[PDB]
Ligand binder design. Structure first.
Ligand SMILES: O=C(Cn1cncn1)c1ccc(F)cc1F
Ligand SMILES: O=C(Cn1cncn1)c1ccc(F)cc1F
Ligand SMILES: O=C(Cn1cncn1)c1ccc(F)cc1F
Ligand SMILES: O=C(Cn1cncn1)c1ccc(F)cc1F
Ligand SMILES: O=C(Cn1cncn1)c1ccc(F)cc1F
Lengths: 273, 273, 273, 273, 273
């Protein structure tokens, strides 16, 4: 099985690194073409053994599974460029926000009538094989196409099927989620430094605290509120800190963030019309 | 090497589960005595093979390494109860906030002159072997005692030695940290639900997002701000969500929390003497 | 088998109504004396059959269990007035904030050496037999005295024993709690009226909603957050409303309230000495 | 009579539990079909004796009173699926927000001319027989149909008839109300824990406080402000706590919540039209 | 003229790099000893040719001008270690916050009566020869010592003499100032990314904008408000952005920052006394 990447190099690098680290694909079975790929990600992909080309048509001819990371305003040009090169064997997997299955199918059907299209919402931690991925299957995706995509993406993290109309919300939650965590870890480290810890220790402790808490929740049958209750002793340090989070509307800020990212993806889709 | 637990069952259970899951000690070499241990954690330890007793003296007589989970207002009672039973072989490991090495050494020295005391600041994700632990060695701790402590606690997560005067700050960061994460995950899931995701899926995706981001930072040489920059495309969904976090002072809330937990631990110390 | 009330008439009426409605005491076995009892509560107690007198000594002479609802600045005068009338049979149950067991015992011990004293923290819903009561037993309270008080106060609601140093926190939670609820219900009814409901229906629906939710939590083994999750469909009306509560720091206000009431009771105590 | 449920399993479970606990319906006279019903509620309904089927037509053929819990975007498909199976005996009771009597009558009249339709706004505490329910009768509902639905729904809580144009406001008040209460009870318990109470005791006391206060208001002829006045002594703990609620705009947050839930139900209705 | 550094490596590295880049000192005439110097700065100083040693006495014996970067809680230990090695030729230049000239002179006078002490407040941009430095001369500093110090520190940025009681305020302004700018540049770049710029370009443009504006102010006889007026056309883009800065209290935040840093330096001094 050959895999190709067209579009944003950040997507190509993350999944190629995860796939090769998982051992589910040899690097020479991966080809990538990009217009925005920087020297760092170009050099990193070459050193991995990934094939690189400036020609999107070459990526299509190489690939069985073709990942697209192409924004809605560029989709008409790319699909017109490669549409005639899509074959019966191809599964086209689109990863950019605001690009609907319907838009891709309509554009590709101008060339061949039953394009196999899947939409993917994944995130950067696939690079350490702890991604969160959902996918939705298109009109002509065979049932084995969804199973194949789930097997591939489960090698680099959590993966499950959803209806397409949930992808905007997933984007606001686990797509953008890692950036919320990086912000939180920077701030928690600032807090540790304010209270006297060296920066490097503060970053390590905060990141380990977040990793361990998330793993506890994933391996627990308990509600996150129950785990919060279990850790906070009466009159203790943690419940005092939880009060100051509540006084700042901490919960509402995170709700605001998921909502804002989700709505922005809907706006990006409306700009494709 | 026998290990004993005296005091709060939430501490005892997490470490006993972690230690036994790590395979570094057999469950029958662990004994615990607790007054606040609930029926569920009572039944869970029995099914693991951990020995249980209502008599703290029996735990002391069984143990070589003795973990204490005793608040500062109870420390005078516990140390006077077991002080005459401390032997040369014992390493006393105190885990409660606000209890200084000096206080423990002074109370135990009324019975035997050179008690071996270590202070531990750990957190509940040791239960899934992803804890964050620091320890400080007391006046009479042998150099091999600290090495032993580090080997044992590294089996259930990150562990490093610190000066005792950093433990308050660690408490505000990685001690209370998991509760901040549980709060954040509850709110992120609420955000996913508001935007149309089923609750169970929203919890899974948010927890996976946090776990993966934390793992990325731990395995990266990059600043958390650089990893954040990598997530956000220009004009995209993520940067729109980061703006609304910033507008609410998200970073400052997390700094406030670390500070509040740290300061409260200092207040708990001021109430012991 | 006789019960007396000295002090605030609101306490006397609430417990007398509850006790007689529970059928555990006949109204004529109850005597009350008060300086602040208004004509409405005077007329209501008389119609119940409760004995009324202006002389606190008569209440003491009639009663076996003697409830005091007397603030700290009046306690020296009341205990000096009735102290010589306290007999071996008396159990003195103090209900006012800031009046410690130690203070009552010290004043009464000037007359007879071993006064049987209990502190009670109850609330006004005892009038509908759904109170929340805790009690702490004094130095000379017999073990059967605590059992007797739990049996009596369980007839008008929940009742359990606590250490005296938790009474301030209970006051902030269930003592003041009903006033938080009355405030919330007035506001929820205002919201129903704003959205088009008649006031009387809005008050009925809001009160039934709060009653039913509280009963659900009392009969559930689940965390309140899990029950909250069960109310909201994704994208639905409830989760939209929960967001606007969170944006205003709703949770933090309720924490602020418990804290403020608890701290005020400590201040009322510091003004007695 | 036989009762059927189509749609959201959370609705089916709540009412089936309440009805069977009230003894007004035998579990085997209830049939439910759902696409979102989870394993926990599947096993719970199975264990109760409720019949389960994947076929909505079977539920219709089984039922006399047919509860629908179907969102506006799914209503056209469901009513087209079961419309030909609606008989003269059926009373169709719709429970989802944004689904009007008019929409159901128009869709069902395509099959049979005078469908008997009632709209129901109920809440989760029917599971403990303390729900708050209102209903509105449709064009062809016989006078005994409203009487029957009030008798049935009164077995699980408060029930009264309203005009349909009040259902949106009831949703914001008593429909979403229990979630406001669960949020409040979690926060009140956090406050109790901050001030030194064990979590389990804090949850019990806060829930009992809210239950008792709600019962007082339901059994009182007095304004909630008058009951609030009765709880607060001058200079006392409660009035200090009420001030901090007021300083945060507590009342306005609850008004905001009722309004936000009500308006969201109107938005959900506009997506049906 | 040999120069030595004792203490924090961040201070030593910046000044050593600046001095060597300015050509006023050969790298082999510089010696540094540090306990917190990391591997990256160890290798960087070695590659420059700076001499490194773990022994502070060797640094003193090598040096004519001796820079100290030692916190007030460590100053007693350092001055006790090297005090006997101070010779008449030495100028001791202290750079740490909260360490007064008087404190240094008092500790060093225990060994030799007339120590030449200068206090320095500098910042990290000395590494690109654009530092901001002030100094105050001690009791026994010869007049040529101040001129020598100003000549040395003027090679790496702005340098002027001040009274010692201004150094805490300078610390809050130009000492901490670069960190305010780094924060501002990160945020400005986030704003550029939100509006569609690539992150690398956004950082470059924002940093160039700040550099150029600062240079304009330094080379103008004009008030910063006049320069502000000159940039803003009526109804234009800039004045619209200035309004949103004003609406958030932007100016007051920067005043808050200078004040907070200045006050913290005073607190660090009082913990030494
Ligand atoms: O780059 C994208 C999406 N994208 C496509 N064109 C512009 N943006 C992306 C990268 C990494 C990842 F894990 C997930 C993603 F969606
Ligand atoms: O319970 C404590 C400390 N404690 C002792 N007495 C009261 N509190 C604790 C529990 C789990 C954990 F991972 C870390 C801890 F410090
Ligand atoms: O009036 C009091 C306490 N009090 C005594 N003197 C001033 N205040 C009271 C009333 C009803 C109730 F249910 C609980 C109470 F604590
Ligand atoms: O689930 C619903 C309504 N619904 C139907 N389709 C989507 N939502 C519901 C559940 C329990 C309850 F008590 C009241 C309700 F309206
Ligand atoms: O590190 C310090 C001061 N310091 C000394 N011990 C702890 N802190 C410092 C570093 C670089 C700089 F440019 C200016 C400085 F003051």
């Amino acid at each position: 099985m050959s895999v190709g990447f067209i579009g944003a190099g950040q997507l190509a690098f993350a999944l190629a690194k995860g796939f090769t680290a998982a051992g589910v694909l040899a690097a020479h079975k991966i080809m990538a073409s990009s217009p925005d790929m920087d020297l760092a990600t170009v050099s990193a992909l070459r050193k991995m053994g990934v094939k690189l080309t400036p020609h999107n048509k070459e990526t299509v001819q190489h690939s069985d599974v073709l990942f697209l990371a192409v924004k809605p305003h560029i989709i008409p040009f790319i699909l017109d460029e490669i549409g005639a090169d899509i074959e019966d064997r191809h599964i086209v997997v689109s990863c950019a926000a605001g690009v609907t299955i319907s838009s891709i199918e309509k554009k590709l059907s101008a060339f061949r009538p039953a394009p196999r299209v899947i939409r993917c919402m994944t995130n950067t931690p696939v690079v350490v094989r702890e991604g969160a991925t959902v996918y939705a299957t298109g009109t002509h995706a065979q049932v084995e196409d969804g199973r194949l995509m789930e097997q591939l993406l489960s090698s680099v993290g959590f993966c499950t099927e959803v209806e397409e109309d949930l992808i905007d919300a997933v984007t606001g939650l686990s797509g953008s989620g890692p950036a919320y965590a990086f912000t939180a870890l920077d701030a928690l480290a600032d807090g540790g430094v304010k209270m006297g810890l060296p920066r490097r220790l503060a970053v390590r402790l905060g990141a380990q605290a977040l990793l361990g808490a998330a793993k506890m929740l994933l391996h627990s049958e308990q509600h996150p509120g129950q785990l919060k209750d279990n850790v906070s002793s009466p009159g203790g340090a943690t419940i005092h800190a939880l009060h100051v989070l509540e006084s700042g509307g901490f919960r509402s800020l995170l709700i605001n963030a998921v909502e804002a990212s989700c709505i922005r993806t809907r706006e990006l889709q409306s700009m494709a019309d």
